[PDB]
Amino acid sequence: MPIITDVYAREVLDSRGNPTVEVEVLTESGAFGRALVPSGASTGEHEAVELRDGDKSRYLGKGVTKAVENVNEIIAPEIIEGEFSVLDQVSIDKMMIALDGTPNKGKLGANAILGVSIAVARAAADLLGQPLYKYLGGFNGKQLPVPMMNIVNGGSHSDAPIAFQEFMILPVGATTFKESLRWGTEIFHNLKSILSKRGLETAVGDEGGFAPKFEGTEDAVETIIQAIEAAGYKPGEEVFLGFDCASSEFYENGVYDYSKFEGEHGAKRTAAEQVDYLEQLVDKYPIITIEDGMDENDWDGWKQLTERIGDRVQLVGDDLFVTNTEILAKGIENGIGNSILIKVNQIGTLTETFDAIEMAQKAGYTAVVSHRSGETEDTTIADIAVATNAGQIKTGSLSRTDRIAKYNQLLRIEDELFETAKYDGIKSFYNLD
Amino acid sequence: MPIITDVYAREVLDSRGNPTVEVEVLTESGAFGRALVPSGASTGEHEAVELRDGDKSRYLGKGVTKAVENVNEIIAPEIIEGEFSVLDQVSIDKMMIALDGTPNKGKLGANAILGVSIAVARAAADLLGQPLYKYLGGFNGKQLPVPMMNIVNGGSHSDAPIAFQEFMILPVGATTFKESLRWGTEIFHNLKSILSKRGLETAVGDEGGFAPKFEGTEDAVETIIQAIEAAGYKPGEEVFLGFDCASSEFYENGVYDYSKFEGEHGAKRTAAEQVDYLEQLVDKYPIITIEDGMDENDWDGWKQLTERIGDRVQLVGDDLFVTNTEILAKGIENGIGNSILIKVNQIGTLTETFDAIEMAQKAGYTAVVSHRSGETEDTTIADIAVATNAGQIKTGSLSRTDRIAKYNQLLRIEDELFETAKYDGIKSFYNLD
Amino acid sequence: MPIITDVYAREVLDSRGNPTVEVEVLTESGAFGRALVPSGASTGEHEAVELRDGDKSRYLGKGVTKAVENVNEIIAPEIIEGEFSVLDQVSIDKMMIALDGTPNKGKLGANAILGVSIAVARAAADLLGQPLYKYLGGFNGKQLPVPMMNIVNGGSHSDAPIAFQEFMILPVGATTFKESLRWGTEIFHNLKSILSKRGLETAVGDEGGFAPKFEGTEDAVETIIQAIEAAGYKPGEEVFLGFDCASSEFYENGVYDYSKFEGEHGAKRTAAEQVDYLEQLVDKYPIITIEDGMDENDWDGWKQLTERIGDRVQLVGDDLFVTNTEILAKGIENGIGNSILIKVNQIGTLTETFDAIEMAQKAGYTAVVSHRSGETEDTTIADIAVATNAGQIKTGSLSRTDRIAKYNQLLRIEDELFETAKYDGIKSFYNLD
Amino acid sequence: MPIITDVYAREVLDSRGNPTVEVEVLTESGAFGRALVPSGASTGEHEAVELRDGDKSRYLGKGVTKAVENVNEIIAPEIIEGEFSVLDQVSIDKMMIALDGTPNKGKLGANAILGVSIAVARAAADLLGQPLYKYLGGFNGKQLPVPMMNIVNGGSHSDAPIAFQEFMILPVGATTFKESLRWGTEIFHNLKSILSKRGLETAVGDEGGFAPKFEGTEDAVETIIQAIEAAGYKPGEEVFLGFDCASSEFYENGVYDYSKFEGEHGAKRTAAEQVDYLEQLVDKYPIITIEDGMDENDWDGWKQLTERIGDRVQLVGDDLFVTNTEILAKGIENGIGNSILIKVNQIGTLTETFDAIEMAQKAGYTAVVSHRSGETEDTTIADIAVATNAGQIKTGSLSRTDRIAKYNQLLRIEDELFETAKYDGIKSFYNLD
Ligand SMILES: [Mg+2]
Ligand SMILES: [Mg+2]
Ligand SMILES: [Mg+2]
Ligand SMILES: [Mg+2]
C-alpha cells in the first residue's frame, strides 16, 4: 500500500559534528525510508541553499531546527493531505520545488527538501523489495564506479606550501570494484608508513586523508607515486592520479596566484601560464583527472584548458557548474570541461540530480557522484552511481566511516549484482579518446 | 515465521581502512538483521581472539576471509540445518561457543561469532517490530547514557609529552541526552578554535578527537577546561573530565615510568606514588572517572587506588578485566575498581556481553559500553547501553561518523522513548557515594 | 495490530475468599491478557493503597466494586481514547499514575492500576508471541529463582509460644529449579509425618504451611531440621533455613518484647540484645536469610544487625522498605539490609516494580519477588523473577494452588528455557561474601 | 488449521504438593489447549487407574514420569501420525481407549489419557474462538450450577467425634451464581469468626474448609446453621445443608459403626437403623442432599434410603457409582439414589464423562460435576457443569485457589452469558418432587 502516511524530520549530527537534517518516510503498508543530508565545507554560488538557524546559543548558529520544522509543519502535511504514492518521485519533487517557490530552495531549505526527496525514494525501494540502484535506474543499473580516492590535501585544507586543494588516487586498472578498494587501501596504508618514517603528520582531515607538511606540489605527487609503487602497483597503468585544484580559491584579478598558499616566491600565473602549467604536470605525471583547474568564472581559460588536454585528461567542473543544469548546458554548448561533479544537496532533489546526470551523459561528459565535507551514515550516493552507470564516484579517502560506509555499500552492490556486475576500469572514461 | 533461513557473511572495511566481518541474517518471513564487527585483537591470553588471514598479498595480512568462510561454511549450516528460531538468542550463542570449542573463540574467530550473534538479535527485533533496546532489555529499557567523549589524546596516540592515552569530557549536568550531545559538540568546536589560535594541530585521530602538542598533562587538562568554559559550561558541575591512563603501556618492573612518554626528566613512580599522583589530580581538577589508572596486573595498586579515591571517582577496568567475567568476579571479590569497560567483541557474543553487564551491575559497578578504535556504521552499542539502563557509554569524540552514528542512534532512541526517556546525569554514577 | 481496544475489570475472589480485581486487555488484533491482583494480610505504610468498598452489606465491607468501576469508567476510556499501543508499558503506567494524581494511588486504587498494568504486559507478550519473562526482561532473562518456602508459622499467624512469624526452607544446593521444588516438597511431606506422629496439627494456613503448637522457637527450628534430614538432605549445605521475624509486630517503646507471643516469661530485648540474639541463632543453625529482623523504624538497629551478620546472612527489608524506592534509596545510602521483598501490589505498576528491582540490584542487594497472603491463580510473579534474573522468589509453602501455581509456572519456564536455563544455587546470594 | 501438530506432557504439582500430569496440545494454526489432571486412585476395581511411578527416591513414590512418558512417546505419535483434527474429540478419546486396551486405563494411565482428552477439547475451543462450555455443550449451554460448598469436615478428615466426612452449604435461593458465591463466602467468614470465639481451629483442610473439634454431629450442624443466620440468610429457604457421609469408611460386617469415629459409646447401626437415622436428620435439619449415606455395596440399604427420603432429598452416589456407566445403569434400573458425583479423572476421557452425565440426566438423576482432593489451577469442570446444564457443582470451600479458581471461572461464564445466563436455584433439583 504505497500512499505516504508519515513524513518526519529530526536534527542529527554530521561527520564534522555539525547539525543536519534526517527524514523518515512511511507508507500505509509500513515501507520505510530514512535519509540524512550532507553539508559542504564551502559552497559554490548559483546553488540550492541549506537553511541554518543562526541561533548562536545552539551549535554556534549551525542548528537546523527551522529546516526540520519546515519538513514537519509544511512539507509533511502537503504530502499526507495530497495522498501521494511513494512511487511518484517526480511528482513529489516537483511539488516541493513549487511549494518553496524560490530558485534556490531558500524558503524551505534545500536540506529540508532533499531529506524528503531521498527518504521517499528509499521508502519506495523498500515497498517494492528492490535494490535502491534498480529502483532509481531501472533493471540495467549494474556498473560499479572507479573511485577517486582522496589521499593528500593542500590549499586551504593544509598548512603545507601547496596551492592545490586535493590529490587523489584512482585504481582504474582493477578488474572489480572490490579489488579497486583493496588497492586503494593498501596504497593508503603504505603512504601512512612513508609519512611516519619521514616524521610527517598522519592524523586525518574531513575526508579521511592526510595533510602532511610536504615541501611542495612535486614532493606531494612523487610521494604518492612512491606509495603506489611500494604497495606493488603500476602508476599510469593500474593506478592514476587526480587533482582538485579548487583554483577559484587562489584566483584573483586575472591571476592564478600561487603565492596565496605557496609562500612569497609562489608563481603568479596568467590563464595562459596556468594552462601551460597543468599541461606540464599531466605530461610529467600520470594524471587522469583535474577538477576546477581553472577559475569558476574563467570560461576563456576553461576553453583553452579543454582544447589543450581535454582529449586525454578529464576536466571536472565542480565550482564551475554547481550541479546546475543551466550552467552545465552553457558549458556543453561552449566546449567547457568534459565532466561534472554531482552533489545531490547542491541541487536539492533526486529528480533534479538525475536530470543533471542525464544531461551530462548525453553530452559525452562523465557525471561524478560526490560526497561533501560534512557526510553522514547515509550511503545513497553509492546507489545513485550504480543506478546511472555513472562509472565514477568521489566519496573520500580510506578512513572514516563517513567515507568507508559508501565503499562498503558499493561492496554490497557488487556482491548482490554477482555475475551481472561490471567495472569498466579505464573504459569508464568514455569522455576521453 | 521466525526460523532462520539464511546466514551470510562478507568482508567489508572498518573506520581505519582495515577489513572486518559483516553478517546478515534472514528469517522465513523476511525479517532481516545486519551486523558489522569492530576491531579487536588476534592475540591475548584472556580475551576472545579475532581471526585474521595473515595473507600479506591482501590488506597487509589483515583480511578476514577465513572468519567470513567460517560463518558461511561452518556456522550458517549449523544454524539453518538446526532450524533455530531467530528469537532463541542464548541457544544460538551457546551453540556457537560449543561449535568453536576453545576458550578464546580462536578456531572460528570471535569476529565470525559476534557477527552472527548481533545479526540474529537485529533480525529478531525486526521480526517482532520492536526497538532493539526493548527486544534486548525488555520493556523497561529507557535510560540514556551519559557519554564519555574523547577529546584529547596522549601516550602512544600522540607525540606530545603526556603519558595518559586519553582525556574525555562528560556532560553529566544535562537534562537529556540530546542536550548533552550539543554541549559536547560545542565544547569540541571551542577547543578546536583554541588549538588553531595557539598554532596547534586540529586534524583528528581514530576516535575523532585531537592529539595536540601540549606542553604536558596540566596544559592539556587546563586547555580542555578553558574550552568547557568558553562554550558556556561549568566544569565540575555541568561537565566533568575523564582519563584513560592506559597505564599498562608505561608500567614495567614495578615502576610507572612516565619517562616513556614525557621525556628524560619524567617521573618514575612506584605504585604508591602513582596512587598519590592520581589523587592529587582528582583533588586539583574535576575528574569523575579514570580508566586503567593502575597496571593490568598490579592488583595491589588497584586495591590501594580504589581505597584511596573509589568512593568519589569512578575507576574503570579496561585492560584490567578485558570483558571477562572470571576476571571481573575476581575484581569484585577483592574490591578492585568500581566500573568495567564492556567491549562486545572482546567477549564475542551478546549473551556473554549481557552476562558481564549484569555481573557488574549486581556488584554495584557501572558497565560502560564501549567502542573500539576500528569502528563501523553499526550502532548496536547504543541500543545495548539503553537496553541495560547502563547509564554510560564510551563511543568517541564529536567527529567521524564511526562515532557520530552512535550518538545519532541515541538521539533516535531518546526521541522514540518520548516522555518515558530518562537521563540521570550525575545520578548515573550509582557506584559512587 | 497493537492498539488497545478493550480494557475490562470484574470482581473475583482471592485465595482467602475475599474480593479482588481482575482485568482483561484486548488489542485490535485479538491479543489478550488477564491479570488478577493479590492482597496482603497486613500492610506496611508508605505504600500504595488498595481500594475497598466498605459496604458492610457485601463481603463484610471487602468488595472491590469501586476499583472495578474505576477501571471500567475512568482508566479504560483514557487508554482507548488515547489509542495507546499495548507495547507502550511505561507510557501507560505513567499515564495511570498521573490520572490518579496522588502519591499512594488512593483515588483510583492500587488494585485498579496494577490490574491494568499487568494485563497490558500480558497482552503485549501474547501479541508478540513471546514468553512473558522475555517480553519483560529481554532476551537474557533465564535465571530461575531459589525459592524460599514457607513451612512453619508463628507470631500472629499461630497460637504457639513463638514470636517469629515465619520459618522457611531454601533448597539452595539443587542443580535446577525442578529439583529444588522436589526437595522442598519431600521435606514438607516428611515434616507433616513428624507432626502427625507428635499429635500436632497438620491443617494449613494462608500460605499452605503449618502452624503447629511447638514448645518454642528452638523446637520449631530443630523439628524443621529433623524433617530436612529425614527427607535425606543436608542442612547447611543442600538446604538452609530462613526467618520472617516480622519484628515490628512485637516491638514497642524501644523493646523487642517476646512476651507478646512467647508468654509472660518471654524476653524483653533491647536492640543490642536483639542483634545478639539473631547472631546467636545464625551461629547455631543454618540460617541464610532473615526478613524484618529489626523493627521498621529501628534504623540504628538495622545498621547494627547489618554490620554484625550482613556479610554472611541475607537481611531482607519487607515492612522496612514497602517496595518504595525512596525508602530503599535511603536504606542503600545508610548501609541498611542487603535485600528487599518486592510486592508488585505494594507499589502498583510493573514499571515501578521493575525500577525497584533495578535499584536494588545496582546496589548489590537481592530483589526477592513476593506473594501476598491473599493470592490468586495469577502467576505473573514467576515471570517477573526470571525476567530480572532476580535469583530468589518467595511464593509459599508446598500446598495450595495459590502457591503451587507459581511453582508450576517456574517449571514451565525452566522447561521452555531448556539448555539455556540456569539455577545458581548458593551463588544466587551475590549480596553475601 | 485444525490438524494436531504437537501433544506434550510434563510433570507438575497438585494442590497437595503431589505430582500430576499436565498436557499441552497445538494445532497447525497455533490453537492451544493446556490441561492439568486432578488426583485419583492407582487401584480400584471399577474405576480408571492413575499411574504413579513408585520410585521412592522421588516424591515418595508419587512421581508421574511414566504417565508423562506414555503421553510423549505413545499417545502423541499416534495422534500426530494419525493427522487427527482437534475437533474430533470422540475419535481421539476412542483411539486412546483402544490404544491402552484395558478396562481401567491401567496400561497408559487414566492420568495420561485424561490430560490429552481435556487439552484437545481446550485447543478445539481456542481454534473456533468459542467459550469452552459452548464448544462442549452446544449453543444452549447456559445454566450456572448451584454450588455445594464444603464447610466442615469430619470422619477420617478430622479428629472430632463425628462420623460423617463432610458438611456443605448450598446457596439455593440466590438469583444468580455471582450472588450465590457471595452468600457462601459471607457464611464461611461468619463461621470462621464463630469458631475463633469458641477457641476452635480455623486452619483449613484439602478442600479449603474447617475441621474443628466440635462435640459431635449436632454441634457441627447447629454451628453451621448459626453461621448461615449470622450472615443474614434463611436456613431451609435461602441456604440448605448437605452431607458427604462417606459411609463406606465406617461400614463393616453389616454394621454402620459410628464408634469408629465417635468414640466407644458411638452407635452401631443396622442398615434399617442407618436409614432411620438419616431420615431423623433430614426431618430435624434443612438437609437437601446426602452423598454416600449407605455403603458402596449395600444396595438393599440404598434402595430403602431412596424409598424413604428420595422424593425430597437428593441422594448422591460417589463411591457407589465411581463415575462408571455400567454401575450407574444398574443403579437406575434398581431405583438406587437420584444423583451421581461425576469425577472426570475417575473415568478418564471427556467423551465418557459426557456419556455418564447424559445417562444420569435421561434417568431423571442430577449429575454433580466434582473436584478431587488434589486439585490444580485447571478450571475445566466449571465449563463442563455449564456445558451440560448440570445445575450443580461440588468444587470446594471458600478458600484456596484450587477451589476458588473454579468459582472465578463460573463468575466469568455467568458474566459472558450476560442476559442469557440462568441460575435455577431450587428448581435445579429436578430429581426431587
Ligand atoms: Mg571540489
Ligand atoms: Mg582503554
Ligand atoms: Mg513479611
Ligand atoms: Mg465423596
Numbering used by the authors:
A (entry chain A), B (entry chain B), C (entry chain A), D (entry chain B): 1 to 433
Paper text:
Enolase is a glycolytic enzyme that requires a divalent metal ion (optimally Mg2+) bound in the active site to catalyze the dehydration of 2-phosphoglycerate (2-PG) to phosphoenolpyruvate (PEP), as well as the reverse reaction in the gluconeogenesis pathway. Interestingly, enolase has been identified on the cell surface of S. aureus, enhancing the staphylokinase activation of plasminogen. The Sa_enolase monomer has two distinct domains, a small N-terminal domain (residues 1–137) and a large C-terminal barrel domain (residues 149–434), connected by a linker region (residues 138–148). Biochemical and structural studies indicate that the octameric form of Sa_enolase is enzymatically active in vitro and likely also in vivo, while the dimeric form is catalytically inactive and may be involved in other biological processes.
Moreover, the structure of Sa_enolase in complex with PEP was also determined at 1.6 Å resolution, enabling the elucidation of the interaction network between the enzyme and PEP. PEP-bound Sa_enolase crystals were obtained by the co-crystallization of Sa_enolase with the substrate 2-PG. The crystals belonged to space group I4, with two monomers forming a single homodimer in the asymmetric unit. Interestingly, L1 in the PEP-bound structure of Sa_enolase displays both the ‘open’ and ‘closed’ conformations. Lys343, Lys394, Asp318, Arg372 and Ser373, together with Ser42 from L1, constitute this inter­action network. On the opposite side, the PEP phosphate group forms hydrogen bonds to Arg372, Ser373 and Ser42. Although enolase is a metalloenzyme containing two metal-binding sites in the active site, our structure only displays one bound Mg2+ ion near the PEP carboxyl group. As shown in Fig. 3(d), two PEP carboxyl O atoms occupy two positions within the Mg2+-binding site through coordinate bonds. To the best of our knowledge, the structure of the PEP-bound form of Sa_enolase constitutes the first Gram-positive bacterial structure solved with ligand bound and displaying evidence of catalytic loop shifting within the active site.
